[PDB]
Design a protein around this ligand. Structure first.
Ligand SMILES: O=C1Nc2cccc(O)c2/C1=C/c1ccc2[nH]cnc2c1
Ligand SMILES: O=C1Nc2cccc(O)c2/C1=C/c1ccc2[nH]cnc2c1
Ligand SMILES: O=C1Nc2cccc(O)c2/C1=C/c1ccc2[nH]cnc2c1
Ligand SMILES: O=C1Nc2cccc(O)c2/C1=C/c1ccc2[nH]cnc2c1
Ligand SMILES: O=C1Nc2cccc(O)c2/C1=C/c1ccc2[nH]cnc2c1
Ligand SMILES: [Zn+2]
Ligand SMILES: [Zn+2]
Ligand SMILES: [Zn+2]
Ligand SMILES: [Zn+2]
Ligand SMILES: [Zn+2]
Lengths: 323, 323, 323, 323, 323
């Protein structure tokens, strides 16, 4: 067939100059994000719940009101769990769904399920409420530029549901949302009409944000097939440092350090990885100290790190998308 | 509905004082244990074998002679192999088998089958006679305190048979004992009469000992859902050291180094991990130089290190149980 | 020369409970430090200048108003430099100067001489105004607990002058105020009336703060006769973390990391060290990125890290003094 | 004083764009250097000796035949030694009489004295004949651009004599050319007529190249007053790398690694360093394997590493000089 | 002179085959040493004390009683201190006083001086009573092959006195004996009637034992002129291990790791090192945790580690000596 599915293998960023980067840095607001994007989401929001719907509405609302012609879809489905068939809902938000190639940013909007205990609630600030807010805050901060899209390539965001186990992490009880959509897409021809290419051939790259939020992350370079793009976040991190544009930051506490990792982490990316989509797994190693504790709350998030990652990521994208 | 299967995430140790610690370090005798508990286990003991029945037997005698109300079982069972059908007997000792919740220590009591070489015999002193002796010594040394068990929690031991492969490593040629027991436990209501919860629900934490006894062990932190418990070993090791109760010991050769391990090792924890039991896998990395050679013998054991880990394990276990 | 001068070698801390620590963390304000004790010193203030007298002046005032009975002295003295003789002044603030033994906290309060460039002035935010405010905030915060000094031990703060070189780093041109004070103290009987014992005998341990206030600092353990005191800084850091009373703080970026250093930094400890005083040199390695640049301003300080090191240091100090 | 002595503190470089960096990298033949600039120097050449005068002569000849206004000088002198007084002869080559400020590159052109063995003769290929050759070649390859010198700053090349000891390394028996040349310049006014300031005040940075030519060298960041220039050598090496311009080179095998060093190496920079000159000491740690052995010859030099470092340096210099 | 003193520069060792290595292991007995060699040294033994004389005498009886023709000098001398002039007695034991060249091994027989605290007493087991013994036992263990000295090369031991400061470490107050004996050897011709070569010229390598006998030592490769012999100590530790000739020993806790050092440790080698004698400094880094505490006692020595270092040292000496 046509070879556009190989394009992703040769695609270069449009690196930005200092003045551009000063602009981007000034364009994102961590407090706006914190107030209007993220505090809504710090609720018990596990699949089913009132939380899940409130969270779901909140995401689309906040997307809905932007100037770029974002196409929100829901994709409610049903899957078996160790408590029976429960109902899930993935969020997709697409720009230019005819864009044969998309760069995808994705995270997970469900919250793990826990019995209230001591009258506390798990609300999953880093796991993964913050990554949802960052993707939100990037759609906003970059809206004027993202409008320019009316290379055949645009941007999709995915918010997955049912990432976490219901009882116990196993292949059977985990990634409900992403195993659904991996399949759905591997079987949806793309572009419409085509005869050999799926919605996955048109994932250039999947950037999975998971567990972001805590002080002192270090992100490993998980895959050779996305390493060049990891290097670019290294380069972006550096230059935004060399230019004043990061806060409480030092290069001896870099986020992205050339440290490859041993065994694989399981996460919403796996249903895509093994179908051949190159992945960039922005999850930290070690996990946050508050992982799956009630203490994974607002109080233990380093606003200042998150701001620095907001900027790094926002640049990464404009550079991919050549805006 | 009862949520007692969650009590394990919120479980905290009752940490001990410097009198207590001195007392423990005092009442464990590496030299008795060496003579009374481990020297008997140092024989060819692959499943089948006369060794196996001897060891099985040894193990039960030295438990049967202590005062606390241990209940030993011998799950003997058949299972297929590359050499046809064969028979395995796991050893399960248990205090308070209605103790709804149990902390579990475990190891394997077989020895791998090797032909005889230069009239040398493979006896597995670290793989895994030493862990078996360690476990038996801990029941001895803690006996008077374990009596106290007449939070509904108690202790349980397991000595798995057929951990090693008969011919060659594989899902199908290995972990005969634990694969078997993990299933039978997943299918057993705990507590009697329960309707939705199995005995695995009652396993707090599985501490599994493998490949102990060589010099300069280094134990990684393998799993994030047991990592606060690995922190307690770090912390126990520390205090027992600053208080001068370890032998030939320095912090520049700690045993528990806060280092995270890439992959998964395969071992008797596997069937219980993939079903959602937390594991504290006390296996070192790298394995001991003598691994799976005829040199895994007594002459190459480090008394001092084994004795240090006894103290550490014994204190871990008392703090877990609140004794 | 009695045998009191060796008690330092056996001194041990009075470790605190989790309730104390909580009080210690809660009773230090980094924002009051920021305006009352630190923002005033951020001015050109090399030796001689009018800044030197104003910073000098500030310090004493901020001490003079506290309840403890601080005995300020001033130690003005003349020395040759590359630009000719000049007049320096060390500040010394002593509790219980008859206190035969003292723990000493010290920084330097000059600022390096630089000509102005682009109309910016060098002010030394980390080199070493934060340290001065740290030492000044510590005496405020701990004031009430320090009236109780009426073992014979007390606390002395020292603010050195002329630490930095005038023109070109060298033994002739550097440490003007601590070469002087060593020697002065090295030859001043202590206690009064003494006959064989100098005031350096009575110096238990000298904690030198320097270059503090940038993000992600790493302090080494430089000297073996003080490691045990470093180790207590390690342990405090850990404990304040595990109770939740540090901020944006992760243990994979501790500040005190058991890492030994090879060479020596020259700094104001040197004249006391080669007099056999025990030094705890809280100077980080690598130096900050803004070292000796005009960018060593307020804008580039990490308030979180300094709250943190303040809490730690305050604790360290109450345990040293058994308060 | 005036202000000019401090201009160096604020000097930024004129970074080169890609096209340029290529043009430099084609500019330099390692083969031309190898045969024209280096092979003449592979001779026994300890001070006094005929290779001492032949070396001296050769160097000069190669500068003389360049366009640029190199002003040569011999500085023959005489110092006490363990074999009596003897006569040395530094070589200085300067562009610009008045260039108030100079970047200096420097290297030592003697050879340690060794009696002959198995008919073998020490010729210090890396110690330091390659550094020399390197400096020559950079003269050669940057002539035309160095013409453009008719910010008041230029270049200077020094080739110290008497670096190595005659007998046994010590302050009194080592560093003969450079202890003399730093005292002499520290007592010569610059610029001519000046009432306050030395030619040292004019030395912007002394780049000392020693021990260069072995495979896989790593150079550390010895000094913090030249760390930004170290960082630039790194940025250059990365960038020359990622553009394809280096040979047999990976970033896993970089030369300039952010690895500070503890204490100091004694080399020809010391006389200048204590006098307040900033130093970029391109010496490797560890020293080469052939260090001070007859085996320090041509056969053990890695031609590929030298080409690469030629490139890196010549760039470093064109960018310091805003050429 | 001549070149006879450049011979150290070329000395290759006569390396042993496995069969010999086994004899040497068999040949030394750590229980013999512990009882007959070291336990007498474990007394308060500063310079001038009766212990000092006790200890001085013991050494000599242990060497007098062997058969090789050890030749005991006794440099006694006076020197000023912070407590007055006092008397010091080195011990020197040569084989072939006329043998031009000499491998020299040395340690120090004094104990620091401490008051008596809780009726406890500082005795210096690691520092340096073990290295004294290790050298004693080296000579017992090797006597028969040492006899074979009737390459003009032989062996020398040195038990320095006064190494430790009397009051507070410092060039004026330390290394009393080595400074004496270094200067006295520098100004003694050798071999007799030589006209420009001293005893120090016929120190081929100085092997300095210090701070030995604690668990888990790591020894840096401190000097480049001695590095090739550190690489021998490494190759020896390896081969002895790969033959199961060391106890309780993994290569992941090697004793000699090829890691270079930054700064410099001050010890009895300085006075020879700045006079140009090659030094293999066997002092660990870090120091023992018990350094200059009362716990530097026999209770805290690692018998296995010492026994392993005896073997390594006895092999090193023989391959040097071509025995
Ligand atoms: O959910 C989980 N339960 C576990 C129990 C034992 C070991 C484990 O690694 C896990 C685990 C992994 C996990 C992985 C990625 C995640 N992203 C967000 N939550 C995440 C959790
Ligand atoms: O038995 C085995 N045969 C192998 C061949 C190649 C690679 C391997 O990891 C193995 C192996 C692993 C193994 C793992 C945990 C064990 N615990 C005790 N023995 C253990 C052995
Ligand atoms: O001041 C300095 N000028 C230098 C030039 C070259 C190398 C150096 O280490 C220095 C240096 C060191 C230094 C050390 C401790 C300090 N504390 C505050 N400023 C400090 C500076
Ligand atoms: O020459 C030397 N003799 C030594 C003996 C013991 C330790 C040492 O570091 C040295 C030494 C250092 C050295 C430093 C830079 C050099 N550049 C060229 N040769 C160089 C030698
Ligand atoms: O004695 C000492 N007191 C110190 C105080 C602060 C730092 C130091 O490095 C030292 C020191 C050094 C030292 C070096 C080698 C020794 N061998 C036996 N004792 C030894 C001691
Ligand atoms: Zn999670
Ligand atoms: Zn095994
Ligand atoms: Zn400074
Ligand atoms: Zn050299
Ligand atoms: Zn000592």
């Amino acid at each position: 067939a046509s070879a556009w599915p190989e394009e992703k293998n040769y695609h270069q960023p449009a690196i930005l100059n200092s003045s551009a980067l000063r602009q981007i840095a000034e364009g994102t607001s961590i407090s706006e994000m914190w107030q209007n994007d993220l505090q809504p989401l710090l609720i018990e929001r596990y699949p089913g719940s009132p939380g899940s719907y409130a969270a779901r509405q909140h995401i689309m609302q906040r997307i809905q009101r932007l100037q770029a012609d974002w196409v929100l879809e829901i994709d409610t489905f049903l899957s078996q769990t160790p408590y029976g068939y429960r109902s899930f809902s993935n969020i997709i938000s697409t720009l230019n769904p005819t864009a044969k190639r998309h760069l995808v940013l994705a995270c997970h909007y469900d919250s793990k399920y826990f019995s209230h205990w001591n009258n506390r609630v798990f609300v999953g600030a880093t796991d993964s409420a913050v990554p949802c807010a960052m993707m939100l805050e990037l759609a906003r901060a970059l809206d004027k530029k993202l409008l320019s899209l009316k290379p055949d390539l645009s941007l999709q965001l995915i918010f997955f549901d049912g990432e976490e186990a219901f009882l116990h992490w196993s292949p059977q009880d985990s990634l409900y949302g992403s195993r659904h959509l991996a399949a759905k897409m591997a079987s949806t021809p793309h572009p419409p009409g085509a005869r050999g290419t799926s919605q996955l051939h048109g994932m250039d790259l999947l950037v999975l944000l998971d567990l972001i939020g805590a002080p002192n992350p270090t992100f490993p370079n998980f895959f050779p097939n996305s390493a060049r793009w990891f290097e670019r976040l290294q380069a972006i991190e550096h230059e935004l440092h060399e230019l004043g544009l990061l806060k409480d930051h030092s290069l001896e506490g870099r986020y992205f350090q050339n440290y490859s990792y041993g065994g694989v982490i399981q996460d919403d990316h796996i249903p895509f990885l093994r179908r051949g989509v190159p992945v960039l797994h922005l999850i930290p190693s070690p996990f946050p100290e508050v992982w799956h504790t009630m203490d994974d709350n607002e109080e233990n998030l380093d606003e200042s790190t998150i701001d620095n990652l907001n900027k790094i990521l926002q640049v990464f994208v404009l550079e991919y998308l050549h805006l």
